[PDB]
Design a protein around this ligand. Sequence first.
Ligand SMILES: N[C@@H](CCC(=O)N[C@@H](CSSC[C@H](NC(=O)CC[C@H](N)C(=O)O)C(=O)NCC(=O)O)C(=O)NCC(=O)O)C(=O)O
Ligand SMILES: N[C@@H](CCC(=O)N[C@@H](CSSC[C@H](NC(=O)CC[C@H](N)C(=O)O)C(=O)NCC(=O)O)C(=O)NCC(=O)O)C(=O)O
Lengths: 219, 219
Amino acid sequence: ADEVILLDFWPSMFGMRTRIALEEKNVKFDYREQDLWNKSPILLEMNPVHKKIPVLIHNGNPVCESLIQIEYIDEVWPSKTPLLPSDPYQRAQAKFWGDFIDKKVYASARLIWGAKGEEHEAGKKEFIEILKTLESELGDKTYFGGETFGYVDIALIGFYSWFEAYEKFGSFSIEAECPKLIAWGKRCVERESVAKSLPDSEKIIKFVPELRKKLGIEI
Amino acid sequence: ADEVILLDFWPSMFGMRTRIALEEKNVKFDYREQDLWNKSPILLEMNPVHKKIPVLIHNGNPVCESLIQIEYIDEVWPSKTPLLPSDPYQRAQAKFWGDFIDKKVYASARLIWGAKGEEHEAGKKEFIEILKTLESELGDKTYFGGETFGYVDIALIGFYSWFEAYEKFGSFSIEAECPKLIAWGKRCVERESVAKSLPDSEKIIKFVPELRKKLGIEI
Ligand SMILES: N[C@@H](CCC(=O)N[C@@H](CSSC[C@H](NC(=O)CC[C@H](N)C(=O)O)C(=O)NCC(=O)O)C(=O)NCC(=O)O)C(=O)O
Ligand SMILES: N[C@@H](CCC(=O)N[C@@H](CSSC[C@H](NC(=O)CC[C@H](N)C(=O)O)C(=O)NCC(=O)O)C(=O)NCC(=O)O)C(=O)O
């Protein structure tokens, strides 16, 4: 009777964030796969402004934007170990890195599998620099959240599911460039929340050609 | 001791947010005008990732990104009413609208004063549609924050200082399109925090031609 619905699209690293946050809080939810090429009434009713997934619907009330949903989850299901720190400065730094990930990672990553030529190579270069900036922030910590798996980890880890695809389509190795970020990603995939929520990496690889066709990309 | 330094640029609607938040809290701060064409060592040290103003420096600790700074300010210093609601759902709605403003308003507004031709006319049209969306959200409420002036009001009000400029350089009338949004803006500029923080609309108009030259825009 506390009802939680998640409107989502399986390979979305953004939706993965809200799957993971929910699993971390042990919240039971109803996952509803959406067709973004034939948008459903419920998606169009719940996110009228942007018409995007994920949408988290809690007792009929929609919360849009994946990072906003992580924070809402953290506040509504509070725990001994919070996803966001209570210290205001440390909270602001977590928000900063979430904002950074939203601004930077996807746009460069998309040029790896979804473009060709000069644009593609410039996208690969920028994507690696962005990862190195994140790897420098992580430093020698277990998680971006320090000893605890937190907001920034959740913000980034959905992208990890696509790393095999980025390596394949960009003919390069992320482990060679960012070994510590790889070690971090392996650690996070050992968590139940993450292992449950991320699709298989090969499934993503298999889907890229179909996805390219659906997005009008000819490669 | 408590030291609050704000690295800023006078006509920035992003920096205006942080000025207004600090004034709502009655905080004593040191405002430090920055030359974005000859960036200072402090700006570069305090915002190494983006190298952008505003930067809020609290006892030597920097906080980057204007909306993040409003939230930090709200958590750190007391006021009669908070800038963000304590209800998680309302808080998430406020975040939603702040994110919407950051994603949409500037990119269209920039085409009004900073472009010519088809691009300019399309920018004016999109800017109007964005304002109408915002005006529908506001509805018949006194503030976006309902009865209390808050986060969303602060997120948008800096752009109000530029409306006379947008109408002049776009040869159009926002009041004709969005009268309730104009009423809102007039109401907010009566708040002492806002009146102290916004430049004179005329000072902005007088600056546009210089600003165009500095940005390499020929009009
Ligand atoms: N900030 C929101 C972002 C949520 C979001 O983007 N949701 C979309 C699906 S997540 S898969 C990544 C996405 N891809 C698409 O949107 C595919 C279709 C789109 N037409 C495209 O060409 O990319 C993406 O990030 N794309 C790039 C871009 O946005 O510039 C979604 O629901 N899309 C529906 C749509 O019609 O676009 C959050 O964090 O929640
Ligand atoms: N999200 C941050 C945004 C803070 C930010 O953009 N700060 C810049 C000053 S605010 S004035 C509007 C700004 N204009 C510029 O950046 C001028 C120079 C720029 N090179 C340009 O041509 O636009 C803006 O919004 N520009 C549009 C854009 O950035 O896409 C700032 O410090 N700029 C420094 C710079 O070198 O760019 C927040 O909310 O705080």
